[PDB]
Symmetry: D4
């Protein structure tokens, strides 16, 4: 039922992305961007479809996707964008700077819990069950499995719906300016990770 | 060292027609909702300081607050995350043009893990800071001679630290990093007052 | 089970001419200064419950508060240290005649280390409590049916729990120990509100 | 520094016709069921102390127990949680009109995490307590002058500490908080004797 | 299979003219000075068990205590450090001829770090031990059938386990190691009663 | 699945005229000085395995040791650090041409933190490895068929794992890193036997 | 006064006594890797014998005869270690022992510091230096400081035992201490056999 | 006597030898963020060469020739770090090395302290100060205390190595030590490739 377009290297064009907000996710060979290459970028406009883009080893360029990432009129939605921003900026040399993060939004609104993972959020906010089984798999394979392609699409298909709910909660609890300042700093927090401070809360006393 | 002591507020801003002011606070503790602001310290960088005693329940300090709100004047702190919280909580205005020597030390002094004011004054200025008066009753009606000297010393050197740290930030090409951190710092302090003082808001968990 | 849902307050105290009332609350979190009171639940012990939706900024609940301040009525909680704090912070009245089933469990169920409401209901009543709705948006304008049944079942069994624990407290000759703990509990909750929520005030360090 | 040394008990109560007495104890250790009470120290706050050696197997000390039972005389301890347990356990009498300087320190000295007797005596009185004789044989038939002086120095200043803490509790409006903690402290000590010494009875877990 | 429930004591020792007896206990908790002995379980190894309810304050159990003090009869426990301590504390007799399957397992089942009774019965005997009833009210006047069957299952297999462990201890030539551990075990339980329960008396620190 | 069981040694090397042999061991535990080698398992990668019971006190295994010493045959292990140590300790010969799938996994499966053989077989081969017989009595005279099948399953897949891991090592350009780790692996195992088993010899501290 | 010997005692003339204070120096805390280098003995008369042990030495007949003597109590501070390395080097496990650390843990219940330095400072007002503890004890020639540190760890063990024995009698723990000392050689054997990281009596 | 240079050794006249002592100073412990600032060399003759490395410098031909010479053993204390930052900066990973920290971990089994200061104090009775360690090593002009501190960290490595070789021989661990030194360049490569927080041989 869910249409998933799979691409090699880049989007063919931006026909599906003349929109004000785009959901973004990535798959990699690990959590360390200097060691673990970008393997997949996922995108959704919010219409129930997704694009899954395989990134080859040593790929330096993805003009259409990077046009989206640098377009200040388009908000990039992420879940825990701290990671996705870092590997994207590392790979293509462009740090997106108009972002919304559903993990940060959750930490500022779902104050009645300590579990802010995407699976827990989708279940509670949308009654949608996400599987994390394919997360630890070989994302650098020449041909992605059906299950990998569906996992990868599942991580962007719901971010618009989550963002809409979190914005209502941020308004209801009067934390919009707080959230906005956090989103403003998130790209620099990702840059700090790339520069060597990934283990350091830079605002902590010690 | 000339240390001018005041009750409630500065009498005027004659000593503060400057581009940056060093700011510090003493309190009854680390929890601003429980522990009242007790002293505000200022220095223009000229070797003198103003020590201002804040009374219990004091809601206003118009001259000092005009300094704190002046977007043309950078406020210099050491670990301003705490000072910004108690100042905004007490007088109702969050300064938003700031420089923090602790964030700056964490961005430049990468060869150490000690970023306290005493360690920094030692290494960068060969100045020895005493911290013995930090745990004392700062809400006392009359501050002791040693409290007043301690309270002054915490702002006397911040201008010199800033100038060194700015040189190192430039040398290592980290100016835009530090600027971005200083920009978020007031909101980081706000997040402390709102209830997130135990949470790294950017951590995975 | 019959569950009466109200906006703002009980309509009257016709169901609560009793010596003990079961009380519980739902909030937006564990930090009363940030996380508002959203729901208050009551039960007389007869299998029925009242679920009271508390609006944002609501300052009074005259009928509910009459019960909380009525010294002829014992208020039964599970971990009242929390409910007492958010009730007192929201409506300005700290209940002072209380029974806490968690303290009672810690004083009687010495053969275990789990003292949660779910474990206690399973062991003493063979009642299966579900905690799935605990993490939900309790500030929603319309509560879900799942939410309303969860909120109610957290008070339906406290009378039966209290009766069992009172027998255990008598068997093990610890009534006076428990009474003294119950008498301090309001002050323990007060201490949380004042800033000592992370401090065991009686510990050595 | 006048220190009267007695065996078994006070010879009489002539130095203790007062409304508050400073009390301390020395033991073979921290576990009252294994480690016997060895020394009981008293001071009226006049700069003298009575050090009372307690014998192995001793079940009574009538003059001391008359003081501890007297509802008209406040007993002042530093960390009376422990002293109350070992005295109630040895002589059968739990004092219930008490003042504890450690609890008072935690309620007032919010600018610090150090609440030992040494740190308090230094900051509030400029008095230097030595802790060297703390680990020594307090059951020794004959106590060294070092031991006798240590034992008396733990009661000589509690009156002066109390007065200062009373002024802080008044300044910060925590008088009724401190009172309620002092009221529960005997039960906190009873709880320790009954087997809950490792349990904060009010903790969630 | 056949479980015999007695009040207070065995009626006689007709079933216990044997060389070794499996012993187990149920209590109100892990702290013998606070948590009373409630049930004692015995088996001869013939597939039947005796389950003896011990009343509150019961000082005497003459047929049971005859077994405990009989130097010709090995008492078999699983983690007898605990059962020994509560029996000695309750009836005043410390058994000194013991075999512990948990110590034997730590000395023979070197290929694993799990040494509880459940995992040992599964591996050595393919017997499934349910631990659901471990946390129940063992001081209840009438014990449930589940309770009685759980309490008997903890002695029905200790003879079989002892035989297998003795074979493994002989295979690996550790018989004299185990014998000395069993000689010391009643003193290790005594050390717990005396106040050293948290202390490895043979550790460096 | 054909499994050949042998007492003492392989009858001959007819099935092992190959470039690489999968190797695994079963012991009485993780401490070679205490825990004797019990079983050695081999596979050529053809879907069959040989399982070799090693007797207590056995000092030679000529044909197996001939494979272990042959520099033209690569020995494949999962976590060979352990297997190399116990084979060297038992038969006095440390193999030196090895491939290890745990080290391989740590150098290629950077997208996970679980590098156990069960998890690797699951993800790379869709083969379900049961670890239930792991904690069993490997010194028994007669091994159960479940034990023999467990023992053979730990060598039946190591060839297929090796091939996949070699493709990953080439794709990520870590062949020479892996090779230096394997070259050092026998000395890492010697270090374990000599007494450094708990020390990372390259760590700062 | 400190007598330094090679390999063994010349005779047992100084050791016709009830109790001997015993101590060792090694290359570390692992007896299977770290060899026995020195053995120190005192009779309690304020003198000591320091016995350099050679690499590969398998016997020391006069010392071993002391360690074997059921009539002579061997006194240690933390004999768990010394018994292990003596048994592992010479094949004989002493079985008549007294350990001041266990004694201290059973009597000095007002403290958590049971090191030999604290016990000496408190019970004897004697200051023990530990500087030479980490030094090359396999050196062919031991320094004067090394030789005195070696001796100082046995010169006081008789005085400590007598104090502890009074504390044990005062608190009625004589039979508790005796059973601990009874088990202690086996606790040492358990260390030798592979259980050195395991409290054998713990629940887990 | 300490010779201070900019960028590189002028020539190799003082280093026609078998073993050179090597050390580095940096802006921190992360080679990808914290640049190499100083390289220190000593021939063991009581003198030292202190070389200041400029920001962005990619070559130092005379120094790199020493590091590449298989006939010259490079001596380090905790070479795992120095090898990483040298290979990252100049592109050459030295492969004939000796590490006094690894050797201390293989010989000084009677202690758990293996820092350079602690080792220099016990084996040479030389007192090292770590006060200048936390300082701005990227300064255009190094202070006198910085230059002296930088030199002192190479001045004694030759003497430490001789003592450790005697210990390794006495305890029969020469081959064990040689294999650790052989792997050490790969241990440092592993760090640069992203495994600096992982013991690659641990079970988990
Ligand atoms: N090592 C490790 N990597 C993870 C873990 N979770 C996610 N990753 C890596 O991070 C990438 C993004 O995670 P995802 O967006 O699938 O949750 C994955 O493709 C995987 O490489 C984890 O728990 N451990
Ligand atoms: N940087 C970082 N990202 C993580 C970690 N664990 C999971 N992630 C990332 O966080 C997202 C999913 O985390 P979740 O919030 O769902 O637990 C994915 O982007 C995944 O790669 C981690 O430990 N560090
Ligand atoms: N952060 C957090 N909040 C909780 C947790 N459990 C309960 N709460 C909050 O505390 C309130 C107490 O309600 P109850 O636990 O009785 O449902 C809940 O409504 C919820 O807001 C928890 O585990 N973590
Ligand atoms: N202070 C605190 N309260 C909790 C926590 N988790 C649950 N609670 C509260 O404790 C009560 C029931 O907890 P339970 O004992 O059932 O686990 C509810 O009021 C619930 O909100 C916690 O982690 N901390
Ligand atoms: N075990 C132990 N007992 C202590 C410690 N500190 C004090 N004690 C015991 O507690 C008694 C009273 O303590 P004080 O009033 O001297 O602080 C002392 O005589 C001593 O028996 C300690 O740190 N450990
Ligand atoms: N429960 C407990 N009491 C202590 C401890 N240390 C000292 N005490 C008791 O506390 C008092 C002295 O504590 P301090 O002077 O450190 O505040 C004495 O009464 C002493 O017995 C400890 O570690 N635990
Ligand atoms: N507090 C506590 N007590 C236990 C626990 N397990 C067993 N007990 C107590 O110890 C007694 C003996 O345990 P059992 O022989 O049933 O395993 C039980 O009757 C019960 O009172 C536990 O995990 N926690
Ligand atoms: N010290 C201690 N004893 C326990 C604990 N749990 C159970 N016990 C006691 O020791 C026995 C251990 O049983 P296991 O867990 O080995 O099957 C129980 O029967 C009970 O008597 C525990 O956590 N600590
Ligand atoms: N002590 C201990 N030994 C284990 C454990 N797992 C495996 N072993 C031992 O190590 C041997 C080899 O492990 P395997 O190859 O079966 O995974 C087993 O035969 C067993 O003796 C464990 O978790 N703990
Ligand atoms: N050093 C060590 N080895 C282990 C441990 N657990 C299992 N092993 C060994 O590692 C192998 C099992 O590896 P796994 O399947 O857990 O990756 C077997 O050879 C087993 O003996 C452990 O905790 N520590
Ligand atoms: N690794 C290490 N070994 C020690 C330590 N303390 C003592 N030793 C070793 O244990 C031996 C016991 O002798 P003593 O410590 O009484 O001088 C010493 O000779 C020394 O080899 C320590 O802290 N660490
Ligand atoms: N397990 C252990 N034993 C030590 C340690 N330090 C010293 N020892 C042993 O304990 C003896 C002295 O004990 P201490 O005086 O340190 O309490 C030494 O001779 C040595 O055998 C240590 O850190 N750990
Ligand atoms: N962050 C941090 N860096 C250190 C520390 N010690 C040394 N460094 C860095 O590592 C370099 C190594 O030089 P050394 O420590 O040999 O003087 C130093 O120049 C310094 O940059 C430390 O404790 N913390
Ligand atoms: N990982 C780590 N390395 C250090 C630390 N301090 C110093 N180092 C590194 O280790 C080298 C030697 O340190 P040392 O062994 O003297 O303590 C230094 O030159 C520096 O490169 C530290 O705290 N942690
Ligand atoms: Mn992601
Ligand atoms: Mn994803
Ligand atoms: Mn400040
Ligand atoms: Mn200050
Ligand atoms: Mn609740
Ligand atoms: Mn509830
Ligand atoms: Mn005291
Ligand atoms: Mn005292
Ligand atoms: Mn049991
Ligand atoms: Mn049982
Ligand atoms: Mn294996
Ligand atoms: Mn296996
Ligand atoms: Mn020793
Ligand atoms: Mn010694
Ligand atoms: Mn260095
Ligand atoms: Mn250096």
């Amino acid at each position: 039922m869910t249409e998933i377009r799979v691409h090699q290297g880049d989007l063919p064009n931006l026909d599906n992305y003349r929109i004000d907000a785009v959901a973004v996710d990535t798959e990699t060979l690990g959590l360390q961007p200097h060691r673990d290459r970008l393997c997949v970028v996922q995108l959704s406009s919010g219409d129930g479809t997704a694009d899954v883009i395989q990134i080859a080893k040593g790929q330096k360029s993805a003009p259409n996707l990077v046009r989206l990432l640098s377009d200040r009129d388009i908000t990039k939605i992420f879940h825990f964008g701290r990671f996705d921003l870092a590997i994207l900026a590392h790979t293509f040399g462009v740090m997106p700077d108009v972002v919304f993060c559903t993990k940060i939004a959750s930490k500022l609104t779902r104050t009645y819990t300590d579990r802010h993972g995407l699976k827990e959020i989708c279940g509670e906010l949308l009654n949608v069950n996400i599987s994390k089984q394919q997360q630890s798999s070989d994302w650098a394979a020449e041909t992605l499995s059906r299950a990998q392609i569906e996992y990868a699409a599942s991580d962007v298909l719901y971010l618009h719906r989550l963002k809409d709910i979190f914005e209502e909660r941020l308004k209801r609890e009067e934390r919009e300016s707080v959230a906005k300042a956090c989103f403003q700093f998130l790209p620099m927090r990702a840059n700090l990770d790339l520069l060597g401070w990934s283990e350091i809360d830079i605002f902590a006393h010690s």
